[PDB]
Design a protein around this motif. Structure first.
Motif, PDB file in Angstrom:
ATOM      1  N   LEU A  61      -5.193   7.893   2.848  1.00 48.56           N
ATOM      2  CA  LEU A  61      -4.821   6.597   2.663  1.00 48.56           C
ATOM      3  C   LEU A  61      -5.452   5.430   3.490  1.00 48.56           C
ATOM      4  CD1 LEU A  61      -2.540   6.193   0.542  1.00 48.56           C
ATOM      5  CD2 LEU A  61      -0.988   6.749   2.349  1.00 48.56           C
ATOM      6  N   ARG A 102     -13.530   0.930  -1.128  1.00 46.18           N
ATOM      7  CA  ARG A 102     -13.049   1.676  -1.775  1.00 46.18           C
ATOM      8  C   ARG A 102     -11.503   0.878  -1.599  1.00 46.18           C
ATOM      9  NH1 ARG A 102     -15.618   2.574   2.827  1.00 46.18           N
ATOM     10  NH2 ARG A 102     -15.226   4.412   3.703  1.00 46.18           N
ATOM     11  N   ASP A 103     -10.534   1.572  -2.083  1.00 50.09           N
ATOM     12  CA  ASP A 103      -9.206   0.888  -1.848  1.00 50.09           C
ATOM     13  C   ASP A 103      -8.998   2.061  -0.707  1.00 50.09           C
ATOM     14  OD1 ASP A 103      -8.729  -0.722  -3.928  1.00 50.09           O
ATOM     15  OD2 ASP A 103      -7.447   0.615  -5.103  1.00 50.09           O
ATOM     16  N   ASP A 104      -8.597   1.377   0.503  1.00 49.86           N
ATOM     17  CA  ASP A 104      -8.116   2.020   1.668  1.00 49.86           C
ATOM     18  C   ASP A 104      -7.941   1.396   2.571  1.00 49.86           C
ATOM     19  OD1 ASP A 104     -10.173   1.684   3.505  1.00 49.86           O
ATOM     20  OD2 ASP A 104     -11.639   3.502   2.722  1.00 49.86           O
ATOM     21  N   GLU A 155       0.878  -1.366   0.053  1.00 52.86           N
ATOM     22  CA  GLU A 155      -0.084   0.141   0.088  1.00 52.86           C
ATOM     23  C   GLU A 155       0.959   1.261   0.126  1.00 52.86           C
ATOM     24  OE1 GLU A 155      -3.537  -0.286  -0.472  1.00 52.86           O
ATOM     25  OE2 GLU A 155      -2.521  -2.199  -0.942  1.00 52.86           O
ATOM     26  N   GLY A 200      -8.398   6.010   4.865  1.00 51.40           N
ATOM     27  CA  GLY A 200      -9.851   6.126   4.512  1.00 51.40           C
ATOM     28  C   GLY A 200     -10.772   6.784   5.511  1.00 51.40           C
TER      29      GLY A 200
END
Ligand code: HEM
Ligand SMILES: O=C(O)c1[nH]c(C(=O)O)c(-c2c[nH]c3c(Cl)cccc23)c1-c1c[nH]c2c(Cl)cccc12
Length: 411
Positions: free
Chosen positions: A161, A219-221, A113, A163
């Motif tokens: 990052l 989400r992407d988080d 990440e 979220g």
């Protein structure tokens, strides 16, 4: 001897702001300094040279668990007082205080990440944030470079990052600083862990609410990535997810903040260099390397001997606590000729401001992006950055080292 018993507790304001002369004397007498503790207890060995610091963070024999070291068990795994539960459950869950295999698995699930490719696609938004921050901070009375810039910048970056809302940026900073009252170099005097305890509790509820919300959106988080692992067979608890969140939020900014702030004090004390950066933009990367070794944000990290080890000309017994002075190593004449001179032309990739070994800085790449970009914004955003005078206040912290507030002055 000649010089007295060495440690990092109870330093006077003026030596906190400039400890390098202290590291110098001790380092010149001995590369390692043992500091006993009493009746049936472990002494602490302070490492001052670059070579020894590298060995200490390299050795598969120095771990992060005191309770594993001592073979005892009435001993806390993390340097947190047992009477404090919330606090203690959140610190035990920090990757930094983890040993392989657990640490290996968590670092691996996480490392993807903060990839160089993700960081690159973030440089733009980081640039945009920094600029807008310098806008609000400029239309202001007695601007404080810390709470008004160095602190919220990395917080907004790590928060997006994880979220979590940016609107909480000030609330996150406050609790982070409160929690920070638990690191080993601070007092425990008057209002000790008290505030760090409450800070831990708020973060636990705050993050617990977050994770409990995952499976709405996705989400992407980091939060969603983590909760996703757990729900599809990954072995991790909420206490694990919660601590990891706190760990990233803190690790994500307190170091970036202290670096940015101290980068300003350094440049103001070296106008020739600051005036160089202003005229030559491409020098930024190189300068960031020097600013980093010259006055690193993390002055001390600790490891624990899991078996006897010989460092320098001393034997460090199993159960010993070892402290690597990163600030001292970075100014080791044995490796950096004229350690006190700000020299942006010396070769890079030698300074240990990001650590070393398996615990090397997880977000080193991100960190370096925020530093270059943040410094830029300052150089271009505040023409008078190096003029006049300022007023600084350092915190009583030898681990997370740097200004609590840095005031500059208005046009
Ligand atoms: C200029 C800013 C930064 C500096 C100087 C810095 C420095 C360090 C140092 C010296 C360590 C080693 C601690 C030890 O060995 O005990 C470390 C660990 C760590 N840092 Fe950074 N850091 C910075 C920014 C960041 C950022 C922005 C993030 C967020 C992505 C981050 C996440 C971490 C993590 C997760 C660890 C622990 C890794 C492990 O235990 O394996 N750091 N940092
Ligand atoms: O207090 C210490 O002695 C200490 N040592 C280290 C270390 O890593 O060696 C840390 C620490 C935690 N997270 C860190 C990160 Cl992300 C970078 C560098 C150091 C640390 C800490 C630390 C920082 N804040 C803490 C709090 Cl709030 C509690 C307990 C320990 C720490």
């Amino acid at each position: 001897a000649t010089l007295p018993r060495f440690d990092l507790m109870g330093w006077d304001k003026k030596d906190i702001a400039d400890p390098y002369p202290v590291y110098r004397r001790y380092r010149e007498a001995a590369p390692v300094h043992r500091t006993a503790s009493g009746p049936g207890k472990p002494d602490t060995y302070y490492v001052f040279t670059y070579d020894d610091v590298v060995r200490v963070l390299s050795n598969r024999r120095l771990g992060r668990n005191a309770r594993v070291a001592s073979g005892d068990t009435d001993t806390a795994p993390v340097p947190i007082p047992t009477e404090h539960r919330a606090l203690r459950t959140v610190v035990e869950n920090w990757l930094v205080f983890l040993d392989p295999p657990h640490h290996t698995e968590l670092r691996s699930l996480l490392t993807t990440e903060f990839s160089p490719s993700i960081v690159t696609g973030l440089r733009p938004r980081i640039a945009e944030l920094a600029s807008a921050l310098l806008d609000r901070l400029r239309a202001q009375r007695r601007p404080d470079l810390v709470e008004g810039f160095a602190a919220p910048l990395p917080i907004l970056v790590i928060s997006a990052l994880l979220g979590i809302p940016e609107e909480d940026h000030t609330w996150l900073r406050a609790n982070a600083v409160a929690l920070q009252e638990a690191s080993t170099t601070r007092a425990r005097d008057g209002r000790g862990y008290a505030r760090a305890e409450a800070a831990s509790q708020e973060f636990t509820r705050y993050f617990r609410r977050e994770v409990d919300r995952r499976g709405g959106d996705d989400r992407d988080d980091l939060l969603t990535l983590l909760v996703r692992a757990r729900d599809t067979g990954s072995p991790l608890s909420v206490d694990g997810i919660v601590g990891t969140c706190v760990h990233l939020l803190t690790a994500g900014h307190e170091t970036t903040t202290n670096f940015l702030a101290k980068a300003v004090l350094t440049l103001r004390a070296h106008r020739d260099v600051l005036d160089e950066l202003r005229t030559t933009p491409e020098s930024t990367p190189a300068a960031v390397e020097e600013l980093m070794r010259y006055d690193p944000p993390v002055q001390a990290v600790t490891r624990w001997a899991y078996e006897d080890i010989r460092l320098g000309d001393h034997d460090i017994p199993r159960g010993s606590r070892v402290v690597a002075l990163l600030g001292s190593a970075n100014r080791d004449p044995a490796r950096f000729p004229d350690p006190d001179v700000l020299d942006v032309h010396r070769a890079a990739e030698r300074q240990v401001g990001f650590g070393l070994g398996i615990h090397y800085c997880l977000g080193a790449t991100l960190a370096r992006a925020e530093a270059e970009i943040g410094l830029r914004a300052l150089l271009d955003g505040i023409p008078a950055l190096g003029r006049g005078a300022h007023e600084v206040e350092y915190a009583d912290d030898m681990v997370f080292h740097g200004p609590t507030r840095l005031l500059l002055d208005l046009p």
